[PDB]
């Protein structure tokens, strides 16, 4: 009986329940998470005229830099509360390079998931603890069981939007899920994802106790489409009109990613994409409910030098971000477009 | 308190892989058949054998009886063309034999996994290797020991999760090109699955653990059409070959799906066009995939639960009949026999 010939070995893994006790969620963290979901829900369903903003680092590899950023974003968040509902990007990784905070939390090319999950959860607690909601990519069917309670928003990356596995997973998450369009630039797959995630599914996951079980979902009605470019960009009126053209009756507000395929090989293009999105918003576009910005403390990205995490401070080690000030503007300018759009509807 | 699982209606007890593997044990024959299939598949996709790897069979199995009759027929034909073709049966698992084993929206996974495994044992038991789609990251743990070939479908080839899974399977894995007709994603999948990965899967005992893979060097690309159009023609094969990196394995061409272009009657055609590239010396094509069954076409699921279903007819994709299949395979058989001459 030939089995596991390509499996070098298994390693003990702390269960979700165990991790949730080790690194408990403060009452604030749990309240922050609930609030974020409520606000996000109202915005993508049309009940609120504010714009949902998922902004923050491409990926977090430094909890101390992520905390400084959170404080800054929490303040700005306080000044633009009337127009913008801001959620922080607390992403673990990118698509060859650094494997992410869960796999390689030490950023030294060593794998250590147990410590990774600890960092991941501690991070989420630290952030939501200061009152700042967070969003992350739903990488797999197990990992969310360690962090789902502190998350207000979940995104299903372009490479997995067609994955039956990720559609079933979304149908059972306790928060809004954004499905990015295909890497080939089409929306059909993201529209189908939302339809599917709305139904009830029966899949196999692990319980809070680390055991495999047959899960049964309720269906998620808070799934929307995210426009992020592809084989070209799609944040322009002509493209948005084609998108709207594809959403079924009742579909939720579109979200737009200023990066990746939309800034096509350059973070400097994020502010430009903001103008082209702010325009449509001020002129009265109601289908654009949310935006996604990859910003950091200091612009650009970088690589890991000979040594590990000691590396330019506040600088992404994956996709390049825009600096902070460039972010202050981009958001104040988006808040304006929100107000100006508030009038056109009156 | 907190607010998790608000969309989780509930969990259900699930027999562990180890438990299932004892309940429905694999006969020595089943285990030998599985090993043989992998060896033959490996030799063919790596260039060591001039035969053509053939993954043929139903689009999906919903009837173990009908699947067994078909297996016997295919086993007898497989015995005859064993000199030119290495046949592995399509035994892919409406959600599937696993989610709805009874076919009536009553999702009984435990029974589904039993049927799934019993089926795999029944088939491999008569000496016929089998192949299936690597659905999720847990399911295989209940059937790997019986599988000779695993395919990742178009909608998952880009999934990091499925690339890591392939890197730890004990058999060759075929990655289908994107639903948009491109091969870049399938080529990247093969590159990725060749490396070692660290993911979370469940053990034979139903517990979550950190898995570490060795890397799989037996991953190839499957051409199955797409938006950009069908791709079984020589110019497509050629453009494909030009994109294959150093050390890639032999290409496989799916006759149905995006290449049959919504009409199963086009499979015999793709064959001919592909059989011609082979009979003239094309060695880049080492495998073919065919959605076949006892009776051509497909159907739906009547209010009459399931016992009101046409026998030997697919309840998913349309397939060609046994009759029409035995040709395709005989022509393909010959196309190979020819190739060996052109290379002689
Ligand atoms: N046991 C599988 C590998 C595997 C391990 C863990 C999870 C899923 C699959 C095989 O022999 O191919
Ligand atoms: Mn990024
Ligand atoms: Mn099919």
XYZ file of C-alpha atoms in Angstrom, chain A residues 50 75-86 327-336 339:
24
model
C -20.488 56.091 2.867
C -6.895 58.700 13.749
C -7.532 59.581 10.106
C -10.407 57.122 10.390
C -11.742 59.358 13.158
C -11.627 62.509 11.044
C -13.384 60.978 8.034
C -15.932 58.831 9.876
C -18.797 60.778 8.305
C -17.899 59.811 4.733
C -15.643 56.777 5.027
C -15.937 53.468 6.926
C -12.285 52.362 7.190
C -2.554 57.922 1.690
C -3.813 60.848 3.767
C -4.620 62.692 0.582
C -6.067 59.802 -1.377
C -8.613 59.337 1.451
C -9.481 62.965 2.186
C -10.008 63.342 -1.554
C -12.238 60.243 -1.521
C -14.239 61.602 1.380
C -14.905 64.751 -0.677
C -19.929 64.314 0.010
